[PDB]
């Protein structure tokens, strides 16, 4: 590895991506981890860890003696997915803003820009979701709440199975200790994916992605002396992010053919809307 015009160009691109990442994403990983590790002394989320803590606060004591509504699994799942999609609007807008700062992206056919983002955002939302997760739980209600992993896992099927594979992913992804500067390039690589269905012009997307991959390679070597195959491990995380998205799409096919009746407390329905 040498310091040469090619390396300096790849560093200039990493710095450009980091600067537009900071402008695009007000909730950075650093800010997420500071909330999860106590540091933000004025940002102290309430922990929801059981049915009692779910219904603490005057606001919520009134669902303690409400009588559980029977509904189809199907209808409860779809209402949750309608809500978390609606609540993703800021993330989608921020990712779109970020994509426009990737050199070459706004020169692509505008329909290809829409295709890259309408598939890419879901993998980047799960990347952001990892930032909100530790082994114990996940930040909810714009960082004011913390829903426990084991409480989510305890809920009746299929809901109790929705989040555990995202936790399994997050604790392993988070163990790589990427920072915001690593993530800026990671996310750019995901967005400039030449394999998205329905792309008109694949080659110019692959040309930008090849340059982003070289910038990621150099970034990880300079930023992570402790992990010599971090680049290969991150390329495998990109596969894992696609598999989680595919699992959502498949589960939705499966739930849509079920006619199971069940209840889910309205306050648990509300919390699932903050997830993905």
């Amino acid at each position: 590895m040498q310091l040469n015009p090619e390396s300096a160009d790849l560093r200039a691109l990493a710095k450009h991506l980091y600067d537009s990442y900071i402008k695009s994403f007000p909730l950075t990983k650093a800010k997420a981890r500071a909330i999860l590790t106590g540091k933000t002394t004025d940002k102290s989320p309430f922990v929801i860890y059981d049915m009692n803590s779910l219904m603490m606060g005057e606001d919520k004591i009134k669902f303690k003696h409400i009588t559980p509504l029977q509904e189809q699994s199907k209808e409860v799942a779809i209402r949750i997915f309608q809500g978390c999609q609606f609540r993703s609007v800021e993330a989608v807008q921020e990712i779109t803003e970020y994509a426009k700062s990737i050199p070459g992206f706004v020169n692509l056919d505008l329909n290809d820009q829409v295709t890259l983002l309408k598939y890419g955002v879901h993998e980047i939302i799960y990347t952001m979701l990892a930032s909100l997760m530790n082994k114990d739980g996940v930040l909810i209600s714009e960082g004011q709440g913390f829903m426990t992993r084991e409480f989510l896992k305890s809920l009746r099927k299929p809901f109790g199975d929705f989040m555990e594979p995202k936790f399994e992913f997050a604790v392993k992804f988070n163990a790589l200790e990427l920072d915001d500067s690593d993530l800026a390039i990671f996310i750019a690589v995901i967005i400039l994916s030449g394999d998205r269905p329905g792309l008109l012009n694949v080659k110019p997307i692959e040309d930008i992605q090849d340059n982003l991959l070289q910038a990621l390679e150099l970034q990880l070597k300079l930023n992570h002396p402790e992990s010599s195959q971090l680049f290969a491990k991150l390329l495998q995380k990109m596969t894992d992010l696609r598999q989680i998205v595919t699992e959502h799409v498949q589960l939705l096919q499966v739930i849509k053919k079920t006619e199971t009746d069940m209840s889910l407390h309205p306050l648990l329905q509300e919390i699932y809307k903050d997830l993905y």
Binding site: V89, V92, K100, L117
Partner: peptide, 21 residues
């Protein structure tokens, strides 16, 4: 379009002015 909601948000953000796209 089964994804017209998501596509619209992306399109408005790409084109610049929410109210015109």
């Amino acid at each position: 379009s089964t994804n017209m909601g998501l596509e619209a948000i992306i399109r408005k953000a790409l084109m610049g002015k929410y109210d015109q796209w």
